[model samples]
Target chain A: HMSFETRFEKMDNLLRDPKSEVNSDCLLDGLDALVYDLDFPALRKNKNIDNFLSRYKDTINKIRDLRMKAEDYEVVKVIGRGAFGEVQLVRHKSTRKVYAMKLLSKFEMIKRSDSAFFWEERDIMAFANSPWVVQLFYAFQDDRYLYMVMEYMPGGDLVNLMSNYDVPEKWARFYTAEVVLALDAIHSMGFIHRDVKPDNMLLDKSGHLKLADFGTCMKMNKEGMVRCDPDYISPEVLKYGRECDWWSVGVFLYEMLVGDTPFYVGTYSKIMNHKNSLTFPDDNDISKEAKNLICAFLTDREVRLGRNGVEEIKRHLFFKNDQWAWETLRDTVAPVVPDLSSDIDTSNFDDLEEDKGEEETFPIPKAFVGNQLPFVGFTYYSN
Target chain B: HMSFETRFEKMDNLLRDPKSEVNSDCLLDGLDALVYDLDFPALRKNKNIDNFLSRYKDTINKIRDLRMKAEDYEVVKVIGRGAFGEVQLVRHKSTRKVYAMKLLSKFEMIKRSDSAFFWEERDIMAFANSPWVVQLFYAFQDDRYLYMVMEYMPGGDLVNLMSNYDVPEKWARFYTAEVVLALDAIHSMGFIHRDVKPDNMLLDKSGHLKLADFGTCMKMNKEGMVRCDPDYISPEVLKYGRECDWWSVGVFLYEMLVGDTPFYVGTYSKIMNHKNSLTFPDDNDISKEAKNLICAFLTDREVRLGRNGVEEIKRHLFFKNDQWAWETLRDTVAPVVPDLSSDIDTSNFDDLEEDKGEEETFPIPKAFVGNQLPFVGFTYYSN
Candidate 1:
């Protein structure tokens, strides 16, 4: 069951003692985030965790709901928002584990014909358990919301982390390679990751990355085609094929070393005009071989990695000095899920309205997070 | 037996992938700092792990080593260095667990006349298997290093976390309580944690926190005249006995709510003078009751949190909402030997220098990290 109030009280006292050497604040915060703001009751009267169990026990609960039921899990705070969703931290009640819960309100699903995408994305993510990918522990749905409980990464985004600090060549190789392998697994499983950008890559405290934001994944049914942005898009995707997935890998790496793309000027006009010049940024610190590989992926549409499988890319010089195994990541940079605290966003839900679709029919951005009525939890427009 | 090389290879490919979903270039940067800077061969030859490990097999050897032999935890990365010393991400090769090793080589040790005080401090840290405090996995020595291999936190310091974000109240309580309980345990055992600040707190990926860095902890002996940094130190610490411990708790709480010290000034000169004449800083957001409590601890040492046992502190409105009894932290977070990967820094003696000083002294600063080495297999660090 859940003992949210009792847990937060213990946390509050220790936090007051700044000189206190406990890091329990991290767990508390992660759990408290579940409430959007850091609002938690110090004590609850006759609040049996079993009460919560009875409420959602047989309901169509999502991952977050079940996770909230687990002891030690207490929702501490909300970190982000989107038009149709929000992400919060939950501490495991008994085990004191903490995790991020991405909530998708069923009530806010864009009612359009494509509204089923939520179900699709949820189904794919629910079954997705990869060493290199963001882990999804459980998924359940209520009449109003569909929540996905996942790994809580303390380090935020990979791109932000890289840009914020100086990433050395070897480390870049190791991390980039890990994502590649994750993709390899996903691709092999007939799922195509439609969004492969730094924003989606999250880092755990240990510096291991959890590839998240699977909103755009599509099943690569045989010769299937999935849609994505054309900039990092493989030539195949623009022409409705499956090959662009690997090409996007090249773009991702190029941005990694160079910090920018040649086709990516500050302005949209310039980027569109220079789209044909698929060169890397001028100041990229890399070998000619690295450049050759990038350019090859850029121009060699027919055989980007030469179809030898992901191993060929691993053999490249940039990847030459790195490790290429799952256990490697598992043993070293594995994403650990802590005990749960509580999950429920009590703040800022009244600030915005859920997607009750206004005025005219418009294209919904791939990321949508916001709040619906009657306290299902707040949502915000997501990136 | 180690597959560090393989992990390195895989990491490389993951970063290099242009379309890899996890944009981990930033994570790579941190790793790159470890790999490129530290030498690997020397780590392999270092006798800290393999040979000594050959002598003892499990916990007995580990406990003895922790009590006597932990001087060998070589410094790898200088995550944070302070006046007490430095906190480094270190690794024990044979054990293959990465640790935040606090080293105080013979060099920075206060005059030998201060032996009892130092031993008492060690005694305090020796009590680490607790869930609230950072685990002191093993303490051992090479020819010249005094290493305390505490749990390695991939997440950075809490001070850093608190600075950039507006943490909610309940979440803060959860974390703060853990530290309070940890302090309660220490106080009950007749010890005072001197450097109890956010920097001493580390977070697991799931946001669970473990209190650490006790280089400054003072023994609250049966008869006590305690001492510590007055800047953040409590009024109780300024007193002639254990009562001083409570005053510091007030100061600790003040720092937590205000995010900065009330005694803070432009210089250390000002700091010393302000210790007695210091006025608590503006805490516009905290309640009047909380403010009064903080002031009470600052001005009156006898009536601070220590006057009340851990339970009384828990009852404070400051921690008004939390559950204390249930287990909150995770067992995985408390591992004496965490499962690790190949890239963890495990090199010992790679940068070990000959003893210097009055012939009998070796010079490694207590809690100080030497960053000029390399990370070995299964352990990542500078040599």
Candidate 2:
């Protein structure tokens, strides 16, 4: 008869074997990596669909299995820029469908530290299925660039919209409500959106809200940390919990009502120490309910409305009875519809004509791609 | 000084070494592979272009480096089929451009034996850059299928043309001259076309000839052997040599003039034994030049027109007075104009409607993709 130690040790030996685990881990990671972009409401009418979550399940799975050719897309123009790389307005050479291709330099990703962290952004973006979140149709990589061919938000970002005009309190409330919905849905998935600002809040062609840029997002279970416009970040988010999203949402509401962040302190330590940083313009047309909601969210971690959960924030009077159902946001026309001239229109976006004039090509180090398998069959899809 | 044997052994070691010639050879092969698909006249119209060969230098290099995403294309319909797989009419989900995607099963390729040899067809097709050949815009693969996204040949093949009506001598001469030009260009590139028949001769939307189905093509340097329809093949080509093409071209000419092959004997041994295999119908309206050309091409090796060189055949009396330049066959209008109703017309193609009703989905084994890296970034484009 075999002793307990002898029997258990055999199982332990297999589990503890590092070399065998390495091979198995590589194979599993490959299978897991093949993962989407899409539409809602009308698509949900199919009855086969359970919710927005499963609406694009087949589409996303197809994208996961398929590998595409770079020859299929023609780079039309440079759309926007970021810290690591720029976005290009790419037209499919075959379908003529336009996509905003976000190009992230692999070299910059390594320089920023673990490439795994950036891939987490890809995962979270792919995971989201709500209309309030910008859709990712395809995620692919070459030696130089990590590409995300995403749904083009022709209506432009909220920051770009606010550049030429003052946003009204009523419009601000409506937009803020949409953000609340987006945030609630995101948080439900246990994700903390650390970068919530006007720039990240974009509008689709119909002018509905779509939260963009998941680069600094993290799962709530992990130690909360982020990189974002300093004015919007809460004190504790530097390395703590998910309370930072509430503060940022409030800052976004304040920006919509007052045309900018309440506090101008960009320094992390200075901003952390400063309390009661909220300020108001004398001509502020904000309602008492709006002010109360913003003030409640901006308060310290213990008193923040989102601390209990998104339900407390949603209960705020600013989001009272509406003509539209939250389940079907497409039911109502947005407060300010973008003046989109055509499908490829970018007039709503500021300095876009100026942006395309200089399409920069970055130099990537050879080692950046040489070390990895270089991401085969990475893709996403939007309906 | 080392003896001749020692020096020879040292040279052999360097040739076989992985770090030496093998590494350089692979790099050269990759560079050499990035080669075709473009508009000739328009590309040449740019006088600033450094070299005709270098025109697609950067473009081909991009094709070489880029890995594509499958999300880029939307499969619209089943277009055609062959022994191993089907051709789907796929549209770029982004660009909306159409392509005829030939999906060859990797499993079937392995089952047929010598997958390396089949890639010879891919290599030769990719290497040729001429208007006379069907343009392969992209070459890519997945674990289950090796895909070729090619320019859609809307006008169908010469076989399909013959099905409707007998081809006139003027049109036959025009087509034969065009094939000659295509063959000349192909031979100049040092590749032999083993399958030369009416079924392989396709016309584009404008009724320009495009020699296709290079699955049996091989480089002239290799000991030539291939797949050919028995009725079209010469005796010597049963097991070897480049002489088969000239004979097939003659058989194609005979089929065009008389609506069928000249020799009734389909057996290789019988055809070899029957010295007087050439027959002509009494009612046939065959020109002396045409008959002479056909007879010369059908004759034994030493006396064949194309035996010595293409120039010997080009100087034949059949091409004495051209209505147009042979250098540019696209300059001449084809004899038969297909009754195409629209840009996406499929009327010219027989059995396509019957084909799609049974759109097949082959069952691929799990081990099929497990062994390979799976197909990465297989793509094609046409100018």
Candidate 3:
């Protein structure tokens, strides 16, 4: 009378047991091997069914840990909203530590077929242990929502500052230099940021820029895929690769320095058509060294500055100062300090739509109904 | 006419050129590709010689970077001695930040045939960025000594305290549990910590235990060579591999709990002969849970505690407290705090033999004269 679904659920429950004498990792590895080796027909066979049932009983034991609950964090207020979910400011009930919890709906995840991409964001942020990148602290999931807890950066983004006042050339240099280092780190590891703009450049409590929102990023490959912001999109993105990231940086630098990107063409077609129409302001207020460095990044793809690698850009005239050790820039007094109250300050963040629904019942995938998929690797630590 | 020695010296000087526009990484990669395709005999031939010389001309260009100098760090005093060289307390002239500079001799490196092992120590420490392990900040080489600058841990090693005072059960548990996580991180990367002892366990600025010394470690499939302090060596080590580290941890716990290691036997042969001589004192002062946990780690290879993973050790009754979240251990206050003057204070460290030899004149290896060998991959960075 045993069903395949029942067997799978049993396996899932057994693997969830932390106190179990049987190693859950071993069983997970075994299940992966068994599933890969057996065909659908072979899986349904009585002999195979009997074998799994026997193994199931042998693997069953009560584990110590219970699933983490929403009760663990006291929700404060909505911080921001994305395509699938809203990010909330939450305080841990025990440690009283503040964190930004991203609540992503399981239904939205399946509908978009974005399981891999969603997991990749966690992986990259966890791997990028630099001051220039936002750190991912803890990631967990319940039946309804996949949760990502990150260190709360209270200083907000560069978008408002760019729109409000003039950014000094030295400040512009410091910010862009940090971004260059961040991008260099990302590119060195074979990743490409498809979207790079003022809005995505967040500032930490310490006031240093921390690159955020890696959802649209992709790894480097020969077979090209194109994605970029309409205004900041690079011409080379018309071709596919990581080189487009440098072009995006170039556009961002121009925007930070001159109040906007190079070519202000209206439509996507026009943007692509007039790629060569990039023009710098005639004012000599910015140093020649600064202009030269900008030109190096914005040059032809074949002879581009960072095309050889980040070292060429590091060796540029603008950053030729002996004190240009990029690693120590985190402690360098930030040009704009955010007005703050405490660690839980939310004055800097803009209000967003904050409606969260009740748990919506959705059918679990057939393959994952009762058994585990490769979710162990999806974890990360921030501190 | 240029002798081979002079040509080798010239090549080294070219690599040492701080203002050379030629990207050293590119030239290093090119030389590797060319050398691999041609043997020594082929390289000596006129056709091969012409190909290399032409490629070398094409590779030459100006790049900028001053070689790191001893002048950068103001030497405070000698801290400790290792098998190869001396470690000194040094402060950076620019940042005024303190670091422990491990100055290793190139002459001694070659003579002891410890070249690769020395580099591996740098590689492993740099890779281990956890709070539970010492961090290597920068690695550089001069003509004489290889310099590894690391964050200075002022509290010194656990050996002094273990021998000096009665270590509380809570503190002992905290220390061992952190080491379990540290060892887990190392093992997860397929590395075996062949040396784990009280001397290898260091206290950071905050009193958390940081696992140190990885010069004797090994990776997977490579037959396990054994090298642990005789008092801490595991029985499985007699057969082969990484289980030795866990046994050492168990032995260390026993020593901390009861003023000395389990087997007080003098020699290696005597220790192995009486492996089962490990016995707990019947005073009943130590909790049964603590004894049980230590016994689990010290049991037969099949039933060992960390045999499965660090999680198994975490799940034991000794650490079954509801407040357990292993990640927060770094911020926890230490049972014993060292009263220090400043960050540069090195009063806790033992003064050791201070002797480093001048660069001994020796013939250069033919394979490394005009080419690169294994130097490209020996890179380390810390922020």
The lDDT per prediction is 0.49, 0.61, 0.62
DockQ of each: 0.01, 0.01, 0.01
Query: Candidate 1: lDDT over CA atoms?
Result: 0.49
TM-score of the B chain in each candidate versus the native B chain: 0.58, 0.73, 0.75
Q: What is the clash count of model 2?
A: 33
lDDT by residue for model 2 (A112-219), tens: 543544555665666677777876776655434678888898888877777767777667767888988888778767777776878888888777888878767766
Give the per-residue Cα lDDT of candidate 1 at A371.
19
Categorize the docking of model 2: incorrect
For each candidate, what TM-score against the reference?
0.34, 0.43, 0.42
Q: Model 1 reproduces what portion of true contacts?
A: 0.00
Q: What is the C-alpha lDDT profile of model 1 across A1-383, one tens digit per residue?
A: 12434433543454234222122211221221212211113211113222222332342123233223323246677767776778777764544557787766544553431233543354444455566677666543333455577767776776656665676666667667777777777776677776577777776656566677876676765555554444665445444444556666677777767877545524444433334665654565677766776765665456557365666776677666434454555455433222223334332112333334443322332211111211211111111
- Candidate 1 displacement at residue A266 in angstroms: 12
Chain A, model 2: TM? 0.73
Give the winner by lDDT: 3
Error of 2 at A33 (Å): 19
TM-score of chain B of 2: 0.73
Candidate 2 global lDDT = 0.61
What residue runs in model 3 are displaced by over 4 Å at the alpha carbon?
Answer: A1-383, B1-65, B222-229, B240-242, B265-275, B281-284, B320-325, B356-379
